Design a protein around this ligand. Structure first.
Ligand SMILES: Cc1cc2nc3c(=O)[nH]c(=O)nc-3n(C[C@H](O)[C@H](O)[C@H](O)COP(=O)(O)O)c2cc1C
Ligand SMILES: CS(=O)(=O)CC[C@H](N)C(=O)O
Ligand SMILES: O=C(O)CCC(=O)C(=O)O
Ligand code: F3S
Length: 1452
């Protein structure tokens, strides 16, 4: 994959612009899935100017006369198999161009060579044909495209009405034309020779290859699109899409004249995300807005450093259009400008070079197209939010600032912005004036009972919010029933699961990166995206959809005649259809209101009473919002909800994203008060009370959002980002935005019945106390759980006394209950007579398919951890190190023969103990993208668990907390995954690689991509798995059952013929023989067993894993407490032995003599309402994935002496952007023979001219040194491990070392040792997570030194926003010539001072010296020359938590 762009700064056409454009496309294949087929690829494209010589001649050769104007071309994919349709297609195409009365010189079959296409693709190949049009009407450049645009839509529309498939017009303008198709980019020129003609000349270019979650090639989905080309993904798409359904309700502009209606819907069916973007971007530009304005209105930068002009503008946009978020490198152009742009988080690479010849070449990597250093005038990149551009009419280049300057210039942004009413202060005022409360406990209690609330609810969850202003953290998995199956009133919000993101895009850090996020809310800002007038700022604005009963009324008053209140409630005397008609009613009443003139709606349960049940706020909000959309009305109101049932963060999230503008949990502020008048909060005023509550819910949301990288509530709102488990298809469709509900579930009639039942509970008689509740924990009360006391005892009894009979009694205890989980709804019947048990496969055999999941050293006691490693190795199975290091002492068997080393090592966001030697002490690497306990997010390890041993392991700082970054920093998109897997397979030639993913609908597809990315195993984790520490909403609301995700992967992978390329594993609550058989039949080959293995080691399931108070030594770092541990290998081994025997017992009954004979065999399962079909369906009823060599292949060959004799060596080689992971293999080899540190620095040194591609020197141990004279791309020294890497411009380059980029992003991610020197600037997230590498570099993008925990980080230059966020431990100095660092640095955990002590001043000096020595850097050398005055300019950045720990104090 890639996007790229090229432009002649002067405006004047050239052939090289196209030849370069090809050139690029020939250097991206190293980033894609190569087929063994040699031909098949996902899509490539080049968007250049229609070449008027070439075309005109053509018209001449047929013997017409060339017009004076520009001649248009339509580039069109016709149906290729039904001639009947091609015609219909061409009549339509002609008719439409005809009624605008332009002129047709006529069709031209495009030459192409289908030999380089694969069959899959030739299959779906359309018939490519050009049609040539002339501007007989003598209109203007601008009018021609405008008209053509209305024409293309007209066609597009008619073909649709005709119901014609496969028709598609890539381009149809007289400025631009697109040559895209499904074939390898390196072969664009082969499939389309026109491109090789010298008449193809052009002032600009835009190329793009693409990847996919597929094996199927659609042609129209290859890019570039008509104005756009996108690398990334736009996670906020359904959000955007539904907004347009309303944005459109009002869009009207005069340029389309009477055409608008043909103009809608601007987004047709079947578009890819980017495709939909281009769609919108286009209309906007067709109506007048420049390119750069549009990038902004749609992919605005974050309004955190910023001039005030810009801020105005931004604020303007944000008020018109809600962003289109997701990682995004974009290459754009309206007719005149050409733009390179970034998403608001700089999520994708985008280097660029400027030449003496007056060209700019935009890129994704950098070595992408030869250019002589000699003619380089600059070497840049884009950072979050920036653009760079060219105005081809004036042949002027604008860098970000200067370009943004320009747009600020266009209008009185501020004066206009000043037109908004921020009703904030007005609202805060009334709160301080006193959050009221008007119910008597006798009431609170009874309503509360209506929505089935409890003490656990009040104590466990509400309280901490009020107190700490933070939400409840907890531990152990979610073992309760899944709500539909529940026995006990659960509220709608229970069935909506929060979606989150896995490999497609990364989730954000809402702590360390809160500045880019946002919760602004606006009532009445929905008018003409098409307009550009100040009247667009006239709207009210909150800063949280969240309102305390005080603030709420504040607002509701300011509104007034303008608001309308709808009674979300229904009679109980009602009848079987009570709630239905209720839902109609509300729907209608809101209609009338809005029509009637109303501008705000207030939906509410307030009139709930003994005679009226409340309509489930969630259902009521959706029913309303949707119908509102469905009648083009939502654009006229704000929709605000008052809910008695609301209480936690989740409930807000759902409400909001199913419509809600504003929410007020009124009966909870109440419940807060009552608590407060028994002084449960102590001194603290009820007002500060709410304040906190509110922050907890605000950060609440910001989080839930970040789980699918979304930075902003307006796109999130109404986007329906949930998945419904349990409610009926029909329903979910009827009333909420689009969401999946893969098995229908209950419907209104059930909902009604349950709502009312709980109701009687609370108005049928007195209520002094809520029940206790046993949702977050087993009480011997109502809610059941998997793990309950009896069950735990019996199991313990069983593995301790070693009786299989006791085991069997446990599992029976377990299997004889009411269904609690989906698998529980299946029977296993077969058609074979039974077989004798002896005959089946053996336990030895079976238990080997079992593994003990990754549970970190930290989360668990050292004793527990190694216990597990011993058990697994004893029975020839495998265990998983876990998110947190593994001690290397452990790399040998002990006198007793026991083996503490673990067979599968993880690799997760904060790369904990990740070392060349760690990565090499195993048979398998598990890329942890996610756990079912907390999908969207990333591990926690409370500070008081960060023992010293722990801290030593992890290179973290003692007793300081370890919260991990939710996304991996080197996996922002699937190609990214792809490359990690490559490095992984490079540093360790023997291991298989796994990808831990978490079930959720859509996993299937990703699953595929993972497969194309060379993963060997894929593991789908259930929603219910365990965690040592994790917020409770994720434990109860993120994730989906494995029975759904595991089949989906089984199916989809099968459906694309990849299902044999990868092995499948699953975990999530598997405690029993049958749980394991059923998982096999659904497709699994391996099963993971954690918690139950913990319980055998003794866990009693008391849930204080986060607390460091383990009654039993399982999950606790405390010494005394660790002495109460009685786990034993022998115990765990017994657990597995039983499990397998119980598996064999079952297979025999089924007539099978082995597990393999039953994988995938879903015909053996019958579901004994929900629709379990989609899970049972069969698609077609009736070593390791190896990888390509790299430079290392030769380097190694050339190093015989190294390994053979010990010699020292110096090698030289060129290097291209296309060579990845250079050295890594070397490193694996060296680490294996001499170990990370048995070689003295520089022992084997390899100079490289040119460009290093991703992962340069990744995992290099000491002894290796790489000099890259030239430059590099992302991830230099990723996981650096005591090796050394240096990078400087070519002796001959005339560039100013420090004013130019030289290495990409996420450099030194997670390193632990070694040095890195860089004559130049580095891009985003430099030194992220560095845990002990020393570096020197002349500058650095934003988010630098983030989450760093060790090492020294010098920095000869300016530094990006949010520097040092979460930087708990190492140190960075920072030459700052403008005393600006103050404006960029992220305070929170760090401080800066000028050097005072002189050993710190000396430390710096020596590095900088090294730097120079290695890099021959002038600018550096000069700082050395004026040390005196200069030292004065740096700034010591030192972590708070490091102040008292530091041998030599930093002060005095
Ligand atoms: C205490 C504990 C620690 C865990 N630590 C990790 C971890 O370090 N890395 C990881 O990728 N998943 C981790 N997990 C999840 C397990 O690896 C596995 O996905 C899940 O535990 C199995 O769920 P089951 O508990 O119902 O047996 C942890 C889970 C628990 C309960
Ligand atoms: C190379 S790419 O993976 O960024 C593809 C981009 C886009 N989401 C698409 O489906 O075309
Ligand atoms: O130990 C850690 O860093 C993480 C452990 C974890 O996140 C979990 O077990 O839920
Ligand atoms: S608190 Fe974890 S619950 Fe198991 S580990 Fe101790 S009993």
């Amino acid at each position: 994959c890639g996007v790229g762009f090229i432009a002649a700064i002067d405006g004047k056409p050239r052939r090289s612009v196209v030849e370069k454009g090809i050139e690029a496309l020939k250097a991206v294949w190293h980033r894609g899935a190569v087929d063994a087929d040699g031909k098949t690829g996902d899509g490539a494209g080049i968007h250049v100017a229609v070449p008027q010589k070439f075309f005109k001649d053509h018209v001449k050769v047929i013997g017409h006369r060339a017009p004076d104007n520009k001649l248009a071309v339509g580039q069109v994919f016709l149906p290729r198999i039904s001639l009947d349709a091609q015609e219909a297609c061409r009549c339509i195409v002609e008719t439409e161009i005809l009624a605008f009365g332009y002129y047709i010189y006529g069709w031209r079959q495009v030459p192409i060579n289908v030999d380089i296409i694969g069959e899959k693709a030739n299959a779906t190949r359309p018939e490519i044909e050009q049609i040539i049009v002339g501007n007989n009407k003598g209109v203007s450049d601008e009018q021609f495209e405008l008209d053509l645009y209305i024409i293309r839509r007209r066609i597009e529309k008619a073909v649709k009405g005709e119901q014609i498939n496969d028709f598609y017009i890539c381009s149809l303008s007289a400025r631009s034309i697109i040559y895209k198709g499904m074939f390898l980019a390196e072969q664009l020129t082969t499939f389309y020779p026109d491109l090789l003609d010298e008449r193809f000349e052009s002032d600009f270019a835009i190329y793009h290859q693409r990847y996919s979650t597929n094996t199927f090639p659609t042609w129209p989905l290859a890019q570039p699109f008509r104005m756009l080309a996108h690398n990334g993904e736009i996670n906020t798409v359904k959000g955007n899409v539904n907004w347009m359904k309303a944005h459109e309700t009002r869009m009207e502009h005069p340029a389309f004249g009477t055409h608008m209606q043909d103009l809608k819907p601007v987004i047709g069916v079947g578009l890819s995300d980017s495709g939909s973007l281009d769609t919108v971007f286009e209309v906007m530009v067709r109506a007048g807005r420049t390119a750069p304005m549009v990038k902004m209105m749609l992919v605005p930068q974050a309004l955190t450093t910023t001039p005030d002009n810009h801020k105005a503008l931004i604020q303007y946009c944000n008020s018109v259009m809600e962003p289109w978020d997701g990682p995004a490198a974009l290459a754009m152009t309206d007719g005149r400008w050409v733009v390179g742009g970034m998403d608001r988080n700089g999520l994708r690479p985008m280097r660029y070079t400027i030449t003496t010849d007056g060209l700019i070449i935009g890129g994704s990597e950098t070595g992408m197209v030869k250019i002589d250093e000699t003619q380089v005038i600059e070497k840049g990149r884009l950072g979050p939010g920036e653009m760079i551009a060219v105005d081809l009419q004036s042949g002027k280049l604008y860098r970000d600032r200067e370009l943004k300057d320009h747009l600020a210039t266009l209008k009185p942004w501020d004066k206009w912005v000043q037109n908004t009413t921020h009703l904030d202060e007005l609202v805060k005022t009334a709160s301080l004036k006193g959050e009221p409360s008007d119910m008597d406990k006798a009431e609170l209690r009874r309503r509360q009972q209506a929505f089935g609330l409890t003490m656990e609810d009040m104590e466990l969850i509400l309280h901490p919010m009020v107190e700490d202003g933070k939400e409840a953290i907890g531990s152990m998995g979610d073992d309760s029933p899944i709500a539909v199956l529940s026995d006990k009133y659960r509220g709608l919000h229970h069935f909506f699961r929060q979606n989150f993101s896995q490999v497609t895009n990364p989730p954000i850090d809402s702590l360390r990166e809160r500045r880019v996020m946002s919760l602004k809310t606006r009532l009445g800002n929905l008018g003409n995206i098409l307009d550009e007038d100040e009247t667009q700022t006239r709207l009210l604005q909150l800063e949280s959809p969240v309102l305390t009963t005080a603030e709420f009324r504040a607002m509701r008053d300011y509104m007034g005649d303008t608001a309308a209140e709808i009674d979300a409630t229904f009679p109980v005397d009602g009848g079987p259809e009570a709630l239905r008609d209720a839902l109609r009613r509300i729907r209608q009443e809101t209609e009338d209101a809005v029509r009637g003139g109303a501008t705000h709606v207030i939906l509410t349960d307030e009139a709930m009473g003994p005679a009226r049940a409340a309509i489930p706020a969630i259902l009521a909000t959706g029913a309303v919002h949707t119908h509102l959309i469905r009648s083009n009305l939502r654009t006229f109101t704000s929709l605000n909800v008052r809910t008695a049932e609301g209480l936690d963060t989740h409930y807000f999230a759902v409400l909001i994203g199913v419509g809600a503008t504003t929410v007020n949990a009124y009966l909870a502020q109440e419940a807060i008060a009552e608590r407060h008048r028994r002084g449960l909060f102590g001194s603290m005023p009820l007002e500060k009370g709410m304040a906190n509550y509110k922050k907890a819910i605000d950060d609440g949301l910001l989080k839930i959002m970040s789980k699918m990288g979304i930075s902003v509530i307006s796109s999130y709102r109404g986007g329906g980002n949930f998945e419904a488990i349990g409610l009926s298809r029909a329903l979910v469709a009827e009333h909420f935005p689009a969401m999946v509900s893969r098995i229908s579930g209950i419907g209104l009639n059930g909902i009604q019945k349950k709502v009312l039942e709980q109701h009687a509970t609370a108005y049928n008689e007195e209520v002094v106390a809520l029940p206790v509740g046993g949702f977050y924990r087993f009480r011997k009360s109502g809610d059941r759980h998997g793990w309950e006391g009896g069950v735990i005892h019996t199991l313990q009894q069983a593995v301790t006394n070693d009786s299989y009979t006791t085991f069997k009694k446990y599992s029976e205890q377990v299997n004889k209950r009411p269904p609690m989980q989906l698998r529980d709804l299946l029977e296993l019947r077969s058609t074979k007579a039974p077989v004798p048990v002896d005959e089946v496969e053996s336990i030895t055999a079976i238990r080997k398919r079992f593994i003990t999941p990754g549970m970190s050293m930290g989360a668990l006691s050292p004793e527990a951890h190694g216990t597990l490693n011993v058990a697994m190795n004893r029975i020839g199975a495998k265990s998983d190190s876990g998110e947190g290091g593994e001690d290397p002492a452990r790399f040998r068997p002990d006198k007793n023969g026991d083996n503490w080393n673990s067979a599968i090592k993880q690799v997760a966001s904060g790369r904990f103990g990740v070392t060349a030697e760690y990565l090499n002490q195993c048979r398998e690497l598990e890329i942890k993208v996610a756990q079912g306990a907390k999908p969207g997010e990333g591990g926690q390890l409370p500070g008081f668990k960060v023992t010293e041993m722990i801290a030593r392991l992890r290179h973290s700082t003692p007793g300081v907390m370890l919260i991990s970054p939710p996304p991996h920093h080197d996996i922002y998109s699937i190609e990214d995954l792809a490359q990690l897997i490559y490095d992984l397979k490079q540093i360790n030639p023997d291991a298989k690689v796994t990808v831990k993913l978490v079930s959720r609908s859509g996993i299937g597809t990703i699953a595929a991509g993972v497969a194309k990315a060379n993963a060997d195993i894929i593991l789908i984790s259930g929603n219910s798995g365990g965690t040592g520490a994790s917020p409770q909403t994720s434990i109860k609301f993120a994730g989906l059952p494995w029975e759904m995700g595991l089949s989906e992967v089984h199916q989809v992978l099968t459906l694309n013929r990849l299902r044999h390329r990868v092995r499948l594993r699953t975990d999530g609550g598997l405690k029993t023989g049958r749980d394991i058989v059923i998982a096999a039949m659904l497709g699994a080959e391996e099963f993971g067993i954690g918690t139950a293995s913990l319980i055998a080691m003794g866990c009693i399931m008391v849930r204080q894993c986060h607390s460091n108070t383990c009654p039993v030594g399982v999950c606790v770092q405390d010494d005394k407490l660790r002495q109460k541990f009685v786990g034993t290998p022998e115990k765990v081994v017994n657990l597995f032995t039983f499990l397998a025997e119980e598996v064999r017992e079952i297979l025999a009954g089924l007539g099978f003599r082995s597990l393999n004979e039953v994988i995938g065999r879903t015909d053996l399962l019958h579901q004994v309402d929900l629709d379990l079909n989609p899970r049972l369906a069969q698609v077609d009823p009736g070593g390791r994935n190896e990888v390509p060599d790299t430079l290392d292949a030769r380097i190694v060959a050339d190093a015989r002496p190294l390994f053979e004799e010990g010699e020292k060596m110096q090698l030289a080689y060129n290097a291209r952007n296309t060579q990845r992971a250079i050295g890594t293999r070397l490193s694996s080899m060296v680490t294996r023979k001499f170990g990370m540190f048995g070689l003295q620095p520089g022992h084997i040194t390899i100079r490289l001219r040119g460009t290093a591609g991703q992962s340069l020197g990744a995992f290099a141990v000491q002894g290796i040194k790489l000099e890259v004279m030239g430059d590099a791309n992302d991830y230099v020294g990723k996981g650096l491990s005591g090796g050394t890497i240096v990078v400087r411009p070519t002796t001959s380059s005339p560039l100013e070392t420090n004013k130019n980029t030289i290495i990409g992003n996420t450099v030194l991610y997670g390193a632990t040792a070694g040095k890195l020197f860089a004559a130049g600037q580095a891009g985003e997230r430099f030194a992220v997570r560095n845990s002990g590498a020393t570096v020197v570099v002349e500058g650095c993008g934003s988010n630098g030194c983030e989450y760093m925990t060790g090492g020294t980080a010098v920095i000869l230059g300016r530094v990006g926003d949010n520097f040092a966020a979460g930087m708990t431990g190492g140190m960075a100095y920072v030459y700052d010539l403008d005393d600006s660092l103050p404006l960029y640095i992220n305070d929170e955990s760090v401080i800066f001072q000028r050097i005072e002590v002189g050993h710190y001043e000396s430390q710096l000096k020596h590095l900088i010296e090294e730097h120079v020595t290695e890099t021959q850097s002038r600018f550096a050398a000069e700082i050395l020359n004026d040390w005196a005055r200069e030292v004065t300019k740096f700034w010591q950045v030192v972590p708070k938590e490091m102040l008292n720990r530091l041998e030599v104090p930093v002060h005095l």
